[PDB]
């Protein structure tokens, strides 16, 4: 989905376009001309709000560049099958009806007046004869991402915007499950995204394997579909294509053959189904946090794979030519146990943060050699061994198997960049489970962070022993005004349990409009509620009272959708019934493992002498001006001085404090910040005599030198 939406993007900023600062608020708003040309719901929530959009589902681009949109004309108060594409200019002159407006089977407008969209964002009833154009489907104004949010007609614009922008952040799991309730756009978005491989022509599959599948065409010509396994995407997540068809099975042209990431049977599936219970539980789900059963962790329900790529290259230096080799100066054989003969870790070796991946030695031959040092070399006969060791190592926080390694060598004419000879990149894969700090979210913008992961026995369970797999606080449902998720939960349960509408006495009044083939569904059935035209409130109320009984012969949820839960710890039933159902929960990519930093001491800058480090030490956290005001407000003068002088800039201070802490000595007094001295020595260079006067109006010589020890 993220790939598909990126292609459909409509950027507004960039060369030849308005910049952020020049973009007045008047251009970021919505206009009545966006209806059918550019989705109003989907757009980045950050500063780039309104400058980035997306084509609607039906939008088309005319040769000049103006975005067209289909409409079907009305010859005389009667709808017509043939459609005509109209741009904004041609829309204003004509009159556009609405899709939801009822129409007789013969095309006659049942009502005398129908809601209409007039020239300039004006809507008002008009006689049924004056209408000149009618929409095609109610889903015309929504983008691809927004078109797969069930019950979008019940959410607010803010939530739907977050819901749309989070389906593009989901992460593919190990095993994908199609949503129980989802709009019809699921299938088409997956087919057109290009992830799945679709048979070009009809045929019978002669042989299928985990690597390739060959289809025997009707013309006698063979074709082999090589499908990639465990291939790193751009952002790190893995990509797999597991065939779904079986040997000897006929396949028709255009059918899906294998399911890429986030796909099940060819329909987009970005997450799992979890038995939600909506109630505040012991504060562990306080203010948008989430509580998860331990079943998800132990059964790999929300387990995900992530691939990291590390690469190092050997380049010819002035002193000599760098070479990747298994021999490194003064390192034990255990640290080099996993390195292969070539000097690069062998496939399948489990590495951790710090181990050596590529054995690289660089030449230091033409470097100064201390008289005592080369004397030592002669004393033992020890090899000069000037070569240094800039050996690739796993950056802090990375682990996992080594799935594969590729080596590009100029000796075999692999077309490497000028100046390098050997270039090896090592792929290390880690299987991340779900833990505290990970972000989950439904399709309705209901974000959250995993507050706690309780054991299975602690989770409240239905009367039949089934423990709810997730709990959502109920204080955030009404305030945010995304009641749609409650509706999704109800319809989710009805889809999971399976219903049998009472038909002996005829269709009940509320079920008159239900399609005749929707009156009976088996358990684990899959249902669809297209955006802006789907299950009504009357229909859900009817289905909830007609769900099939459990295998034990008892109906769990009552007519209102609430069920009697048993407390997992106390063991006594909760005084009042609680909501329960299956909600489709994704797994966002703001994982905790990425967001964790710590720095006791690390590499420092060169011009500013401030902390910074490339994953060798995570690097310091900025202490802005606003934090400085907070410290001043408290009257905390000593703490503020430490945060700015001793541990950020005062070079002699940093060394002394680290020697004092390691020992038992008290931390010494801070010195003069390096930032000030730099400012003074750079203000003097503009020919501005700057002096730090003291009492008696005498300058203090800021330059000072004292030799420790």
């Amino acid at each position: 989905l993220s790939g598909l939406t990126h292609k459909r993007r409509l950027s507004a900023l960039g060369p030849g376009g308005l910049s952020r600062e020049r973009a007045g608020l008047e251009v970021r708003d919505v206009h009545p001309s966006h209806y059918g040309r550019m989705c109003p719901i989907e757009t980045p929530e950050g500063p780039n709000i309104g400058l980035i959009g997306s084509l609607s589902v039906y939008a088309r681009v005319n040769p000049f560049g103006f975005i067209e949109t289909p409409y079907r004309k009305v010859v005389d108060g009667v709808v017509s099958d043939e459609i005509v594409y109209l741009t904004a200019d041609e829309e204003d002159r004509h009159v556009v009806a609405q899709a939801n407006s009822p129409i007789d089977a013969d095309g006659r407008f049942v009502e005398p007046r129908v809601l209409v969209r007039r020239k300039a964002g004006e809507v008002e009833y008009v006689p049924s004869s004056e209408v000149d154009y009618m929409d095609v489907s109610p889903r015309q104004m929504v983008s691809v991402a927004t078109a797969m949010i069930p019950f979008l007609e019940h959410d607010d614009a803010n939530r739907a915007l977050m819901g749309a922008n989070m389906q593009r952040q989901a992460v593919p799991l190990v095993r994908s499950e199609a949503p129980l309730v989802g709009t019809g756009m699921e299938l088409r978005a997956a087919i057109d995204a290009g992830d799945v491989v679709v048979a070009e022509e009809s045929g019978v599959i002669e042989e299928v394997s985990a690597d390739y599948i060959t289809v025997m065409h009707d013309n006698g010509t063979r074709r082999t579909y090589r499908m990639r396994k465990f291939a790193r995407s751009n952002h790190g997540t893995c990509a797999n294509q597991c065939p779904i068809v079986d040997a000897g099975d006929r396949v028709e042209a255009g059918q899906v053959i294998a399911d890429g990431p986030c796909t099940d049977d060819g329909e987009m599936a970005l997450g799992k189904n979890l038995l939600v219970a909506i109630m505040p539980w012991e504060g562990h789900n306080y203010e948008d946090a989430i509580i998860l059963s331990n079943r998800l962790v132990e059964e790999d329900v929300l387990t995900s794979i992530h691939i990291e790529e590390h690469e190092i290259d050997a380049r010819d230096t002035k002193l000599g030519a760098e070479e990747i080799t298994r021999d490194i100066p003064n390192i034990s054989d255990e640290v080099l146990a996993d390195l292969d003969e070539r000097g690069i870790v062998r496939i399948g070796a489990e590495v951790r943060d710090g181990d050596i991946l590529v054995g690289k030695v660089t030449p230091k031959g033409e470097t100064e050699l201390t008289p005592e040092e080369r004397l030592l070399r002669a004393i033992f006969g020890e090899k000069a061994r000037e070569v240094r060791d800039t050996s690739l190592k796993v950056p802090h926080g990375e682990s996992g198997k080594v799935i594969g390694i590729r080596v590009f060598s100029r000796e075999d004419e692999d077309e490497l960049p000028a100046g390098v000879n050997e270039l090896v990149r090592v792929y290390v894969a880690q299987k991340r489970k779900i833990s505290d700090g990970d972000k989950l979210a439904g399709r309705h913008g209901n974000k959250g962070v995993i507050g706690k992961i309780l054991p299975v026995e602690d989770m409240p369970f239905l009367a039949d022993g089934t423990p709810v797999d997730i709990i959502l606080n109920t204080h955030g449902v009404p305030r945010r005004m995304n009641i749609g998720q409650i509706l999704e939960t109800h319809l989710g349960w009805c889809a999971h349990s399976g219903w049998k509408v009472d038909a002996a006495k005829g269709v009940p009044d509320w079920a008159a409009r239900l399609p005749d083939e929707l009156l009976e569904a088996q358990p684990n059935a899959i249902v669809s509620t297209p955006v802006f035209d789907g299950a009504q409130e009357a229909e859900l109320q009817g289905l909830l009272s007609c769900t099939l009984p459990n295998r034990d012969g008892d109906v769990l949820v009552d007519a209102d959708g609430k069920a009697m839960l048993f407390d997992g710890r106390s063991g006594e039933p909760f005084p009042y019934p609680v909501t329960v159902g299956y909600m489709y929960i994704m797994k966002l990519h703001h994982l905790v493992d990425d967001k964790i930093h710590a720095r006791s001491t690390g590499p420092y800058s060169m011009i500013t002498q401030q902390p910074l480090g490339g994953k060798a030490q995570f690097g310091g956290q900025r202490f802005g001006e606003m934090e400085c005001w907070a410290m001043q407000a408290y009257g905390a003068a000593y703490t503020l001085q430490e945060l700015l002088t001793i541990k950020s800039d005062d070079t002699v201070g940093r060394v002394k404090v680290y020697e004092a802490i390691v020992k038992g000595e008290n931390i010494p007094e801070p010195g003069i910040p390096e930032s000030f001295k730099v400012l003074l020595k750079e203000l003097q260079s503009l020919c501005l005599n700057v002096e730090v006067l003291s009492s008696d109006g005498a300058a203090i010589e800021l330059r000072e030198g004292e030799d420790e020890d």
Binding site: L4, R8, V57, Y58, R60, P70, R72, D81, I83, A99, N100, V136, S137, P138, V144, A178, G182, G184, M185, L187, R188, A189, I191, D192, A193, V251, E252, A253, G254, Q255, V256, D265, G266, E267, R513, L514, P515, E517, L518, A521, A525, I526, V527, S528, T529, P530, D533, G534, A535, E539
Partner: peptide, 25 residues
Amino acid sequence: NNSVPGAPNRVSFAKLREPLEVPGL
């Protein structure tokens, strides 16, 4: 009416017939 042959038949609540199929996205 599933355009793609091998589609999972998911019954839908749609009540209005769509006269135009989704274009190549």
